[PDB]
């Protein structure tokens, strides 16, 4: 099989009733990126790329299409059913931006499952959960309505919440904390506590310091692996890197120096499936638990996070995060990602069991062949 | 002298009111293997080797007998009086494997006792106590039921108790360690919970966070020495290795780096009396205290842990685990393994002081002369 | 799909031209167990574990088959086209024993292939060389007479040799070493040194400190981790893992703290292909150069060494090993692995390429339905 | 069995053509210490510690009949036939002292050994070789004079040379070592530089970064073990501690954090035949090559070292020193320990197979009943 033709499309996704505000990032519309892939045959897959905002992580839509263009005509004839080949000739084209790397590797895979007549979880080891749980992440606002939000969430299903803290003096971040575990201690909800990025060293020693009894797990309290690495010693929380873990080298310095509890990652920052497999095994290993998440992005995103989330060994699957809730527009109606009861239900069909309506995109904005 | 014969048994022994449930293995019934060796003098020997299921550990009932079909017809002719010489002679032929070839050095030591006239404690250094202390271990399940059960042990006389958790939401352990130690507090009662290699990080972090003023250790918390070595300096309770001390080599880089407070040891994973001799010495050196316990099995391998644990230092005399009350049938209705006041008596007679009713082992699975 | 039979099969392999020697064992005939699974629909695939005798590693033929004994009957019902699902399901039902759950694996990724219509190199990321670089390996001898054999494979094509040393005085070994470099040197022949774990550190830092001017890397000079880290910082030449990789978890240990240059990696030892392919990306990520042997055996085992390798980036990949030169009778007589010009072309059939002739091996010892 | 009396006896041992002369000590006539133990039944065993003059160790003479004085009184009535449970008495009686418990201790293992008719290399694990290679050590002297003794004693048979220097400047010891090695290069024989806690750090990095062709090994270099551990990654030269190993713990932080390469051991240093034995099992696990000596004496410290010796692995046995050489009169005219061919052959006789001629050590100075 031969890759015969590569379109990239722009497309605009309304957050429903934001902002959503995090640490390091307030948006209120989000430019999502798909590509197809044509094989000479005619079958095609498709992949996506969606940065939340240009701020959040070093990565834009505009530097995704970039980075698409510059690809593309050097990946035509390749052949897509052999990911690692693939990304290699991949880092053959262009050094980094596995952020659009990602968007390649998704859409191989999808056309590899669609030829083969199986499901990409069952391409990446096999399902081990047909349903995978998903968490919510809240954002940052007044504590009573935090807590709130909190306890809705958990009323619906979501097995895990995720609460977003930063950009403010902390005894408010803390008073948050504090009133959404009363409100949700004793319902075996686990918790995460994301700083991303925005705490120094003093208010995360403080977090941590002043709450032991309240159980979460500190996600990327501090800008750098430098600053989480000085802080470990002395927080007796869980740490969990997420923008951190850039790459495969970076989680493997993570697991072998003991720097962390877990992760929160970001399939397209790790560079697609590929390297999320790898990943996903390297913490197996270590029993580590982590999320498969990704910035944003709608139902193709969405499906290759919750097929590689699907073949996670569950008492390590801290969950997969998905925009749906903010989308208001599926690309495919019949068989896209939805959230129910706080968890997702893995689609059925052959590939990421996605079937966009590409009429929705308009016109691609660069096409190769 | 010199040895003319190796017999090896296959034996059956349901778990009284079980299963007994651990958070790598639950169990029904267990398959003993044990080992006679005849001297050219017609004097006998015995031991055992019982693995607590096939998950516990890297060893089973099947693999035990095919290691020792391995190495028997290389031992025909070896002097039985030298236990490192025939420890060596083993590892010539078979590496690894430390559970099989523990077997054939307690039947040597118990071969040597009986030859001259003299206890096994007294061949490994002396009998320090005659009579040593035992430990009960709970197996999972509700929180009060296992206070419950904590609570009659103790006043049968057991001076320790050791809780097992993991393989659910750690709340519920925490649940039930709380609740054990309301009803024990007071009575000074020594404290071990036991992960069983299943909590993440993340979750051994938490229970001792949250629990400063329980005074438990915590046994082999987490699956790989690397993940305790990380989590050390952040837990405040004093941390034991089990599974972890697979081998002399592993305790002398545990005790030489400070990685633990301590050790449940077990003899058939050790290699055997001769090299856990060694780790006694270690131990006391070092002032770590420690329990000397096995697997699973009868009144062979249970004398084998009673007579090295009564060579102990009292003080760091963590007790010998048994499996006495879960086995309805003794090998030896005189002189068999008992506990007594969550206590064990030394049996008096020569070599290991047990004499098995032969009969109950069926014909040997296999002969070597 | 799923599996309805699975038979287990024992076989000689006399050792052409007798004995292979390395410092941890000598063998004159090496015992192979080969597995046959078999789906619903009556398609098959072949696994093979051969481990090269007793002491090499704590592995045996024996053990094989009881490890298989023991876990074949629980997985019965399972979906052979679920790698790492399957495997989880091994270890449910056996702790440890890798290199017996790679025959599984192994057998699992043929079918796999088979069912498909792919071959096994494209199940694992993709073919990036069709024709693989194997190195050829020493016995221990003569220096003299080890310099010509280095000479006469040299010529033969191979792109790399593996001189074993240890077992007697270091001065021999090297004597050995400066021999053999100056036939190959300026031939572009890289070269590796291996201890088989036989060196103490007292020799390891003597042949190293010696020989700054002869370009080998020191393979698995001394038995323990422990005892190669300790001599790592005073060593100048390139330190290689091989027995010490007992596990992904070990890897990541080795690789993340940087405790060696490299590998020579063992598919059984690992635990098959599903293993394997983590263990290569976290080499490619690291830039550590390796192998993709196994400890002995014929086709079927020598084809999913060839498959893994094929995938390796070629600027890392140290070689495929073989026994195949030691080996009389080749089980598929048309497409059955063998070296040629110092290297291995990949099979181009489905799965592993290979058919082997089960007539050669007897009736199967265990049947399980 | 009980002790029913201890006696104490002086004995003067003039140096043969001396003295001898040692960084830390010039010695002309050593004063040992014997001491019998005599149970009720009447049957005796024999211990001795003779310190190499006052300033070799924290140890001497009147120091050595001090402690036996103190302990003495406390040890009558105590069961022999246990030396663990005797030494935790012993230590019940005196801290530390480790050079006068040893002469307990293996009088003790003495009398064991004639009441249950074993040789006390059968009493540690057993005979591993009844020939026990012995090495040759030179006094500090000119570097020719050196040089030839050297070679006399490489052709009397010693497999091993020991090279004393310090105490002057260190172009006199470079030149001594390299004069050393070229009479015994191509001899197969092993070399030892010992410099006896006499170099400060600064020469002792000069010694090894001038000689990288020369394979020594460097004993003791330095005082203490801070500034051993202080050079230990600038010398490629493997380093052994002597004085440093003062107890098992000592032991364990250098073997257990990499801190040397073998040792030089003495007997009456860490405390005795029962913690030798482990410090034996210590070093077996880690392939720590040792020696088993002690700092002077006649038959019966002798004998003492040759059967502990006797029960090293051979591959890691760098030999038993003992002073015979240097002792005109043996106290057993018929079974004493003598080098011949730089070898020692074990005694055949329960015990140690020592019988002293008591009448040569005149009356006890010290009895206690
Ligand atoms: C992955 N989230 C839950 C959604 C946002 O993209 C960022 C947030 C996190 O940093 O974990
Ligand atoms: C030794 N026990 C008390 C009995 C079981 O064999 C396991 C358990 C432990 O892991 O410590
Ligand atoms: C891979 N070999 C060449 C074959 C033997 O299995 C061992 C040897 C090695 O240890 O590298
Ligand atoms: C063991 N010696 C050879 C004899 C002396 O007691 C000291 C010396 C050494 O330090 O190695
Ligand atoms: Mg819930
Ligand atoms: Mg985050
Ligand atoms: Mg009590
Ligand atoms: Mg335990
Ligand atoms: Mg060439
Ligand atoms: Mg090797
Ligand atoms: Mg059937
Ligand atoms: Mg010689
Ligand atoms: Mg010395
Ligand atoms: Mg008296």
Redesign the interface.
């Known amino acids: 099989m031969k890759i015969a033709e590569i379109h990239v499309y722009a497309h605009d996704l309304p957050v429903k009733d934001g902002p959503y505000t995090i640490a390091s990032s307030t948006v209120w519309s989000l430019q999502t990126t798909l590509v197809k892939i044509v094989a000479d045959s005619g079958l095609a897959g498709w992949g996506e790329t969606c940065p939340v905002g240009p701020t959040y992580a070093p990565s834009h839509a505009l530097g995704a299409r970039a980075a698409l263009a510059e690809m593309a005509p050097g990946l035509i004839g390749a052949?897509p059913?052999?990911?690692?080949?693939?990304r290699?000739r991949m880092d053959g084209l262009l050094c980094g931006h596995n952020y659009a790397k990602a968007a390649i590797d998704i859409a191989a895979y999808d056309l590899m499952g669609k030829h083969?007549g199986?499901r990409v979880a069952?391409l990446?080891?096999?399902?081990?959960a047909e349903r995978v749980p998903s968490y919510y992440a809240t954002g940052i606002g007044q504590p009573d309505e935090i807590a709130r939000i909190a306890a809705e969430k958990v009323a619906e299903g979501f097995p895990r919440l995720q609460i977003k803290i930063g950009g403010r003096p902390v005894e408010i971040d803390i008073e948050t904390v504090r009133k959404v575990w009363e409100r949700i201690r004793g319902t075996?909800t686990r918790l995460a506590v994301d700083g991303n990025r925005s705490l120094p060293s003093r208010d995360a020693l403080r977090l941590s310091r002043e709450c032991?009894?309240i159980?979460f797990?500190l996600e990327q309290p501090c800008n750098t692996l430098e600053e989480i690495a000085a802080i470990?010693?002395r927080?007796?929380?869980?740490i969990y890197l997420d923008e951190s873990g850039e790459?495969?080298?970076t989680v493997?310095?993570?697991?072998?120096?003991?720097l962390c509890?877990?992760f929160g990652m970001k399939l397209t920052r790790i560079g697609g499936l590929?390297?999320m497999?790898?990943f996903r095994?390297?913490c197996e290993?270590?029993?580590?638990?982590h999320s498969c998440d990704d910035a944003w992005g709608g139902d193709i995103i969405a499906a290759a996070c919750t097929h590689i989330g699907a073949?996670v060994?569950p008492?390590?699957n801290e969950g997969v995060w998905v925009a749906q809730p903010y989308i208001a527009q599926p690309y495919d109606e019949e068989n896209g990602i939805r959230i129910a009861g706080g968890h997702i239900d893995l689609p059925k069909g052959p590939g990421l069991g996605i079937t966009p309506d590409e009429s929705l995109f308009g016109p691609p904005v660069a096409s190769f062949s």
Chains 1, 2, 3, 4 share one sequence.
């Open positions: 052949n059913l052999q990911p690692l080949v693939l290699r083969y199986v069952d990446l080891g096999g399902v081990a075996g032991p009894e159980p797990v470990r010693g927080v007796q929380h869980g790459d495969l080298s493997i310095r993570a697991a072998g120096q003991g509890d877990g590929q390297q497999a790898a095994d390297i290993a270590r029993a580590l638990p073949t060994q008492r390590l």
